[PDB]
Amino acid sequence: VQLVETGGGVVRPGRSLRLSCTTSGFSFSGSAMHWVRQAPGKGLEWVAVISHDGNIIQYHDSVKGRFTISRDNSKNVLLLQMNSLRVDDTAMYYCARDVWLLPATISYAFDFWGQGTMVTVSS
Amino acid sequence: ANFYVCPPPTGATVVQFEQPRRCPTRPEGQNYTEGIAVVFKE
Amino acid sequence: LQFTYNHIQRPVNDMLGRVAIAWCELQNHELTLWNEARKLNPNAIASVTVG
Amino acid sequence: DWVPKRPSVCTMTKWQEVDEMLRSEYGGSFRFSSDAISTTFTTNLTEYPLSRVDLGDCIGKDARDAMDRIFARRYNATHIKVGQPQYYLANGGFLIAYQPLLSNTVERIKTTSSIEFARLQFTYNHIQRPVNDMLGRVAIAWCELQNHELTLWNEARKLNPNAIASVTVG
Amino acid sequence: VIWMTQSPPSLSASIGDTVTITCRASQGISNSIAWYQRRPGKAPELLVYAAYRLQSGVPSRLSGSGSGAEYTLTIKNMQPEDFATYYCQQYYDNPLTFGGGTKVEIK
Amino acid sequence: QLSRADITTVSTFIDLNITMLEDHEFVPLEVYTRHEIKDSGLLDYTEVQR
Amino acid sequence: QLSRADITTVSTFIDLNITMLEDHEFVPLEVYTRHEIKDSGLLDYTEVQR
Ligand SMILES: *[C@@H]1O[C@H](CO)[C@@H](O[C@@H]2O[C@H](CO)[C@@H](O[C@@H]3O[C@H](CO[C@H]4O[C@H](CO[C@H]5O[C@H](CO)[C@@H](O)[C@H](O)[C@@H]5O)[C@@H](O)[C@H](O[C@H]5O[C@H](CO)[C@@H](O)[C@H](O)[C@@H]5O)[C@@H]4O)[C@@H](O)[C@H](O[C@H]4O[C@H](CO)[C@@H](O)[C@H](O)[C@@H]4O)[C@@H]3O)[C@H](O)[C@H]2NC(C)=O)[C@H](O)[C@H]1NC(C)=O
Ligand SMILES: *[C@@H]1O[C@H](CO)[C@@H](O[C@@H]2O[C@H](CO)[C@@H](O)[C@H](O)[C@H]2NC(C)=O)[C@H](O)[C@H]1NC(C)=O
Ligand SMILES: *[C@@H]1O[C@H](CO)[C@@H](O)[C@H](O)[C@H]1NC(C)=O
Ligand SMILES: *[C@@H]1O[C@H](CO)[C@@H](O)[C@H](O)[C@H]1NC(C)=O
Ligand SMILES: *[C@@H]1O[C@H](CO)[C@@H](O)[C@H](O)[C@H]1NC(C)=O
């Protein structure tokens, strides 16, 4: 299995940025995807989740209404359109797949993680 | 379809049929007891 | 619902029990034919029985 | 005495606490069948958004409280919780809070005044599913038997083709 | 939000000894909790799910336990590859929250 | 050489047709909903007092 | 002399498994008991008058 993330970089506050996460080695259409952030020298924190087919979406209270998660099963690629960035959002974003335990449920746990990319908010 | 070449067998391998199995017993009927009844409600 | 289920389960099971009993009696009856059919052509009888 | 409204009033009341609720998908719809109460509910496969229920904060609390108590009482030593609870709007106006398990091996909902429609569904399914399984085995066994008789007819014809041909030809 | 209190924040152990990492939540979460491991320079990897289900391929010597709001992860025989950061995450209610993390190091 | 279907064939098996029971869906049905029963009363003390 | 089980045996019968329908017990179940329906009213003329 291999997970790759693209779209990281330095961005000014209040600007929009869109990340992408490519997958391989597993049925993307049959597993939910999650986004996790890791601030510099801080602990991990969940960002959002997209179901296997994208019918239901859930966000974190710190990013609800600001972020936008989406997926394309045809191209087996995950995306996270970010808008209205803030200085506190500076962190390493990782895309992870859920733990497949049942056909259509969401385990809300992480089993496979990507290499991660940096998103620094500076002015 | 596929043809087959069968060499003459010998006593090396032997097979037998299964003996008659005892059949299951007839299901037991309900043990009813006829009687008059009157149902009461609150 | 209890009566309806019981009125449908009790007979269906009685007829499922007779079919099973009849099948067993029939299979034991066929053995009398297979014991003789094998002598006529052991190749064909052994092939179907052995698999 | 004054108290907050949302955490005091509800538009949904906990009706039954089912320990075993089997969920199956067929005919394009989920069917939650309970063997304990003998009831079957049909949904649309889409989790009914709990936020759509007017004054329904007591439903996340009541549903989770029963699930935690039931899981630790019976499913702790043999099953594992998979994901978070799922809420489904069933036919007839019943909101079902489901918690999937795995083995170790704004508006107001209008509920119908009679659950007998669902009980008949379970009763019919409880009698159709097995009877069909036993109708399927009998049919399979009959076919296997008929194919078995051919081995005898192929040899019986040589002994007396007149009698064998007469019954087979009609 | 369910806060996750993980302790000890850092401890040292020798190769071939027992260790115990405790994780506590702000409220009773039944058994909805997962354990992760992140070696230096690599992404995290899941170890346990629901506090008792061991992931496929994980060493049997490593196991978790607990109930309610108290949980613990134990290793009966430390190996050189086990020294890493361990995080405890809950999934009882959203948003998902991780633990403070405990870094096991050589002593 | 002639095909297998060139000779007349007679079924030596005693056909037994088995038609599984079709699935049935039960819809809710009530002669009088609880609202209709409440409305059956000529007067309502709650509404009259209100 | 050799036992009967010393020779390989092949079942010449076409097994047919029959699983009888397990007994089922129906428990009482009501969406709203008669007491709940009576309590649904905001006011009761009997209690108010009493
Ligand atoms: C009706 O009921 C059935 C239940 O009977 C229900 O679900 C079907 O059930 C079968 C049997 O369980 C499912 O088949 C299994 O599905 C799993 C697929 O794995 C996914 O995840 C893999 C990675 O995660 C798993 O494995 C890791 C360890 O590697 C573990 O940590 C995780 O927790 C997790 O368990 C991933 O690799 C995989 O993708 C690969 O495989 C698929 C094909 O399976 C392929 O398309 C991909 O390209 C890629 O190669 C996938 O994303 C899996 O657990 C399991 O694997 C076992 O069996 C296979 C043989 O089948 C062995 O080779 C393997 O070693 C394991 O022993 C198995 O494949 C099936 O997928 C379900 N079907 C559906 C449609 O979901 C039905 O859905 C129900 N139907 C309805 C209508 O509701
Ligand atoms: C399940 O989904 C179906 C559609 O798949 C819903 O059907 C709708 O019913 C309303 C009733 O007023 C109609 O106005 C709509 O036109 C129907 N939609 C369609 C697409 O036909 C049905 O209501 C849903 N059932 C439940 C219990 O939510
Ligand atoms: C649940 O089961 C585990 C073993 O699987 C046991 O250690 C634990 O004490 C049990 N918890 C409760 C609350 O009974
Ligand atoms: C059904 O059974 C009858 C005999 O009762 C048989 O003639 C027929 O071919 C079977 N199949 C169909 C499709 O009718
Ligand atoms: C049940 O039937 C199957 C064939 O369908 C047979 O192999 C089996 O031995 C029977 N009995 C049991 C106990 O499974």
Side-chain angles (χ1 to χ4, degrees), chain D residues 72 76-77, chain E residues 52 66-67:
Chain D
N76 178 71
Chain E
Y52 309 134
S67 185

Side-chain angles (χ1 to χ4, degrees), chain B residues 6 9 15-27 30 32, chain C residues 10 13-14 17-18 20-21 24-25 28 31 34-35 38 45 49-50:
Chain B
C6 296
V15 79
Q16 69 189 26
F17 295 157
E18 189 181 354
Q19 284 286 109
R21 307 177 184 158
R22 68 177 289 87
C23 299
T25 298
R26 172 85 73 150
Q30 296 300 308
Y32 292 129
Chain C
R10 298 277 173 235
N13 296 8
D14 191 3
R18 289 181 194 185
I21 294 158
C24 163
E25 292 202 309
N28 294 355
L31 179 64
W34 291 99
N35 282 341
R38 66 183 172 178
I45 263 54
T49 318
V50 174

Side-chain angles (χ1 to χ4, degrees), chain A residues 1 24-31 97-104 107 111-112, chain D residues 23-26 30, chain E residues 46 53 55-57:
Chain A
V1 68
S24 68
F26 63 85
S27 185
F28 184 84
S29 314
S31 317
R97 191 199 78 141
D98 61 356
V99 198
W100 194 99
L101 298 168
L102 287 177
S107 294
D111 184 1
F112 295 133
Chain D
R23 183 234 293 174
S24 62
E25 190 191 333
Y26 51 80
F30 284 169
Chain E
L46 186 70
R53 187 174 154 89
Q55 273 287 102
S56 184

Side-chain angles (χ1 to χ4, degrees), chain D residues 137, chain G residues 15-18:
Chain D
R137 289 181 194 185
Chain G
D15 308 4
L16 168 50
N17 210 298
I18 300 298

Side-chain angles (χ1 to χ4, degrees), chain F residues 15-18:
Chain F
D15 308 4
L16 168 49
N17 210 298
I18 300 298

Side-chain angles (χ1 to χ4, degrees), chain D:
Chain D
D1 302 342
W2 174 90
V3 283
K5 176 163 187 183
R6 286 206 73 65
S8 290
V9 291
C10 213
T11 60
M12 295 297 299
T13 290
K14 167 165 68 69
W15 182 35
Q16 295 293 322
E17 289 170 31
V18 177
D19 294 11
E20 280 174 38
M21 184 75 92
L22 312 179
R23 183 234 293 174
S24 62
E25 190 191 333
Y26 51 80
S29 282
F30 284 169
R31 262 82 181 206
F32 298 77
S33 57
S34 175
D35 182 85
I37 55 161
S38 324
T39 309
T40 298
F41 304 98
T42 296
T43 86
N44 261 345
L45 308 99
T46 300
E47 288 184 34
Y48 183 84
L50 200 65
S51 59
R52 199 186 293 177
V53 180
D54 195 6
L55 294 158
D57 285 357
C58 85
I59 310 168
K61 178 178 72 62
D62 289 345
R64 283 174 171 282
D65 286 350
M67 293 177 182
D68 300 334
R69 187 168 60 238
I70 293 159
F71 178 76
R73 166 166 67 72
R74 224 197 79 154
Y75 290 107
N76 178 71
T78 318
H79 287 248
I80 180 187
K81 273 187 176 192
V82 176
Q84 290 176 4
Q86 306 184 285
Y87 308 89
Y88 297 97
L89 180 58
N91 194 10
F94 299 98
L95 182 61
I96 297 161
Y98 196 81
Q99 169 57 66
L101 291 179
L102 174 132
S103 54
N104 281 2
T105 64
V106 64
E107 68 186 349
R108 276 190 298 158
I109 291 160
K110 300 298 206 302
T111 308
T112 186
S113 179
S114 191
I115 188 61
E116 315 301 346
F117 81 100
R119 308 206 89 185
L120 285 167
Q121 188 70 64
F122 178 89
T123 305
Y124 182 89
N125 282 13
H126 208 51
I127 295 166
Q128 173 255 0
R129 298 277 173 235
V131 159
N132 296 8
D133 191 3
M134 305 329 299
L135 275 159
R137 289 181 194 185
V138 157
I140 294 158
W142 195 268
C143 163
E144 292 202 309
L145 185 68
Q146 293 310 308
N147 294 355
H148 221 56
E149 308 292 12
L150 179 63
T151 286
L152 302 181
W153 291 99
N154 282 341
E155 295 302 320
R157 66 183 172 178
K158 301 173 186 166
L159 305 177
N160 184 13
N162 304 290
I164 263 54
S166 293
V167 74
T168 318
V169 174

